[PDB]
Design a binder for this molecule. Structure first.
Ligand code: CU
Length: 108
């Protein structure tokens, strides 16, 4: 977890919307089983894509204001932002290989 940015409702614009480069945002909660299943895969991706992608997390129990703005309905949900806008989304758990394919489809 050392390479994952900790987001809050108030820091979202500064950290995500004005980010340089692609940022992957994980919407999670402690009670969410599938969310905890993909946590290690996000750490692997953070290492593997270091320098090309920033990974971040937003706990929806602690920051309830952001999810509703993006129409999130379930967790985990992954949002891929580029240039201040959502470029792609993925709802539900997935394997490392599926995540890599999803990223590669959007990073160029
Ligand atoms: Cu770490």
């Amino acid at each position: 977890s050392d390479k994952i940015i900790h987001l809050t409702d108030d820091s979202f614009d500064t950290d995500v919307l004005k980010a340089d480069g692609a940022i992957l945002v994980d919407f999670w909660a402690e009670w969410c089983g599938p969310c905890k299943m993909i946590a290690p895969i996000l750490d692997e991706i953070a290492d593997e894509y270091q320098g090309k992608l920033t990974v971040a997390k937003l706990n929806i129990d602690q920051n309830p204001g952001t999810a509703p703005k993006y129409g999130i309905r379930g967790i985990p949900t992954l949002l891929l932002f580029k240039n201040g806008e959502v470029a792609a989304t993925k709802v539900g758990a997935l394997s490392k290989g599926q995540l890599k394919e999803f990223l590669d489809a959007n990073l160029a």
